[PDB]
Design a protein around this ligand. Structure first.
Ligand SMILES: Nc1ncnc2c1ncn2[C@@H]1O[C@H](CSCC[C@H](N)C(=O)O)[C@@H](O)[C@H]1O
Length: 288
DNA sequence: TCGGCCGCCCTGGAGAATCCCGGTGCCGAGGCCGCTCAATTGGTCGTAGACAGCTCTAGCACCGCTTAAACGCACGTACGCGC
């Protein structure tokens, strides 16, 4: 599909003597997957600012990052003054809530409802955190969304962000079936999925003991995908974290139920997919 | 992908009812006394029934035919039973 045409801006590599840690703005953070991947790659983080509403996700971040995260409330409360007073950013990330962007809803409300239009909030903060002309600072940005969108919606998003959406499927690097569009200007945006041997490709490596995988991988019949003691059992939450690439026992931070952990892990990013995406940032920024 | 209502399980605390415990009155049961009439004793007959014997009726026992009816098997559908 060639509807628009624009070259991706490739920044020159900075040497090690002018190497600086990253300043990261994370708009729709949720479960703090971005800072988790950044800490796993061994990258020094000078400032991480997450604008999260949901208190369970804020609790996930406060437990798993120990007060490193600077919290904002709603993204509508962020102005241009808040962007220009919190220093210039080096990495902007986010994925808008796809309640009305997904075409799996028969009665979907579209891009221009209060769940979808938050994307434009992103664009506004994309417009504020972007450096002006004449500044050769390497500025990188990343937007995530689902594959189940309309043609006009994806076309308008691609025109607004001015980048080619690469499609990445979790089955090439992890044990999940979800294809996601990624807008951004990272180097090697469409390079193939370098599967890490430490990543759990099959489903059975993500299971616990005493459980047999019925399928080869899981999706995002009135049965259950795991047999347990010759009985079909629901897929566990820690096993869901191992499928989604998270560390073991990650989203157990408060007194939330099983349904809350499902709602948090469903909306979260895939750790291996991000690790692939954030990989070339290591040569552009600080290392630890 | 979303949270707005909606039935389930558990548990907690009001809440009416009931059990338990004394406190006081009350009236009917236990006990004592006269007496009176029926229980008892002694004695006498009369006959109802215990007992021996004889009889003779039918009740049990056995066998042989004879079919009348019970037992078993398949089957199907109509009512029992659950929802
Ligand atoms: N107006 C808003 N501003 C900021 N966050 C919001 C928001 N509305 C919803 N959110 C939260 O932000 C998250 C966006 S949903 C997708 C999250 C993202 N893909 C991830 O990496 O986890 C949701 O968990 C939602 O609870």
């Amino acid at each position: 599909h060639d509807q628009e045409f624009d070259p991706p801006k490739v920044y020159p590599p900075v040497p090690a003597e002018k190497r600086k840690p990253i300043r990261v703005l994370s708009l729709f953070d949720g479960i703090a997957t971005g800072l988790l991947v950044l800490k796993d790659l061994g990258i020094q983080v000078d400032r991480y600012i997450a604008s999260e509403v949901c208190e369970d996700s804020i609790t996930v971040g406060m437990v798993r990052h120990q007060g490193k995260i600077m919290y904002v409330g709603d993204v509508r409360s962020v102005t241009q003054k808040h962007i220009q007073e919190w220093g210039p950013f080096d990495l902007v990330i986010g994925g808008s809530p796809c309640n009305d962007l997904s075409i799996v809803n028969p009665a979907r409300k579209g891009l221009y409802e209060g769940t979808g239009r938050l994307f434009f909030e992103f664009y506004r903060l994309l417009h504020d955190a972007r450096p002006k002309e004449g500044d050769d600072r390497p500025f990188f940005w990343l937007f995530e969304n689902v594959v189940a969108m309309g043609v006009s919606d994806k076309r308008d998003i691609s025109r607004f962000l001015e980048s080619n959406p690469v499609m990445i499927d979790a089955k090439e690097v992890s044990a999940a079936h979800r294809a996601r569009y990624f807008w951004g200007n990272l180097p090697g945006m469409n390079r193939p999925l370098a599967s890490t041997v430490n990543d759990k490709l099959e489903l059975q490596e993500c299971l616990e003991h005493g459980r047999i995988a019925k399928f080869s991988k899981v999706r995002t019949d009135q049965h259950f995908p795991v047999f347990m003691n010759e009985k079909e059992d629901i897929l566990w939450c820690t096993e869901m974290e191992r499928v989604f690439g998270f560390p073991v026992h990650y989203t157990d931070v408060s007194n939330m139920s099983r349904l809350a952990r499902q709602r948090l892990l469903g909306r979260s990013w895939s750790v291996p997919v991000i690790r692939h995406l954030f990989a070339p940032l290591k040569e552009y920024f600080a290392c630890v």
